[PDB]
């Protein structure tokens, strides 16, 4: 049957492995049938099983990851896989808050002398 | 040389596989311009380097 990704996500983790190895098993005689000179219809099916194995193994790799990052969601330290990987130069920059830090000398300046809104005539 | 390393034998494996000609049906395509394999390496003329 046409294996889809939508129905594979709700199944049990061990149920996916029960489906995964059978796809691995069923692909085994398909490579045998190529060497022995099988029908051309069965030779077109082996790409479907390769993509179906990729679909099953993706969900296993997918569904494991949001379980891990939900487990590490509240903790202080998280693995580097769950950390945001975006263009090392800006991972070395400051946070959202740290360049918003003004000194006590500087904060006195805008309170005492704020920038004014004004206009002049002709 | 009968004595070989794993690097050379793996490297010689690719060049042997690339010496086969083009398929019969490759010029049945639409925008294909290839008439024959121009990279056919003969062991007498081209010595592959090394």
């Amino acid at each position: 049957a046409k294996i889809k990704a939508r129905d594979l996500r709700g199944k049990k983790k061990e149920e996916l492995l029960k489906q995964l190895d059978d796809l691995k098993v069923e692909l085994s005689q398909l490579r045998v049938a190529k060497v022995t000179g099988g029908a051309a219809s069965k030779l077109s099916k082996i790409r479907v099983v390769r993509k179906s194995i990729a679909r099953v193994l993706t969900v296993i790799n997918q569904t494991q990851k949001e379980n891990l990052r939900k487990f590490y969601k509240g903790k202080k330290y998280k693995p580097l896989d769950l950390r945001p990987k975006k263009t090392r130069a800006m991972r070395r920059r400051l946070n959202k808050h740290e360049e918003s830090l003004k000194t006590k000398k500087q904060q006195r300046k805008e309170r005492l002398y704020p920038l004014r809104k004004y206009a002049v005539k002709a | 040389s009968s004595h070989k390393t794993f690097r050379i034998k793996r490297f010689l494996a690719k060049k042997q596989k690339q010496n086969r000609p083009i398929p019969q049906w490759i010029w049945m395509k639409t925008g294909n311009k290839i008439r024959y394999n121009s990279k056919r390496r003969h062991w007498r003329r081209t010595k592959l380097g090394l």
Binding site: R92, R93, L94, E98, E99, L101, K102, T103, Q106 | -
Partner: protein, 203 residues
């Protein structure tokens, strides 16, 4: 306070007190390696003027630079050309020895960044300098609004571009009629601006 009394105390290097101390530190610094970490400043007064603050993230390294000029690294004379460039012995390096000490300290500890450096002793063959390094990723430096300009990627390896106090002296830049050949970005920028053809559309 006590910092003022040390300021002119180091201005009396010919006195008996300083001459005893300077020959003891010079002997002590000579038996050590050419690159090692000093745990606290020998000159606490000098480091405060240059910007050092006694907190976590402020690192200082004490190294030595071999004294003398620069001879041309050529095989036995290797000057195949006009008599002008035949000079090989009495040549001099464009940068000072203190700027060399900032370059060597920053190249070794590549994770830190050079703030400034000062003089702590010299010999016939060696000059000793303490070089202040800043850790740009320590939260004391990172969260301090005054000292977070180290953390920007623009200030990577200031000593390599001559942006420090010791390196800026050899660039010949400044205000006045004595620095006409460095007007603009640098010495290279002044020559580049003065050696271009401004070919306009309408000429």
């Amino acid at each position: 306070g006590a910092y003022k009394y040390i300021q002119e105390l180091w201005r009396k290097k010919q006195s008996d007190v300083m001459r005893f101390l300077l020959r003891v530190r010079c002997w002590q610094y000579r038996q050590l390696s050419a690159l090692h970490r000093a745990p606290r400043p020998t000159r606490p007064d000098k480091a405060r003027r240059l910007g050092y603050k006694a907190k976590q993230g402020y690192v200082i390294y004490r190294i030595r630079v071999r004294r003398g000029g620069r001879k041309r690294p050529v095989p036995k004379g290797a000057t195949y050309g006009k008599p002008v460039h035949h000079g090989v012995n009495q040549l001099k390096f464009a940068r000072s020895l203190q700027s060399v000490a900032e370059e060597r300290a920053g190249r070794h500890c590549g994770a830190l960044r050079v703030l400034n450096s000062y003089w702590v002793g010299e010999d016939s063959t060696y000059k000793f300098f303490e070089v202040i390094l800043i850790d740009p990723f320590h939260k004391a430096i990172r969260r301090n609004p005054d000292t977070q300009w180290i953390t920007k990627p623009v200030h990577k390896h200031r000593e390599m571009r001559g942006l420090t106090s010791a390196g800026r002296k050899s660039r010949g830049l400044g205000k006045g009629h004595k620095f006409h050949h460095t007007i603009g970005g640098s010495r290279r920028a002044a020559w580049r601006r003065r050696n271009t053809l401004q070919l306009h559309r309408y000429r």
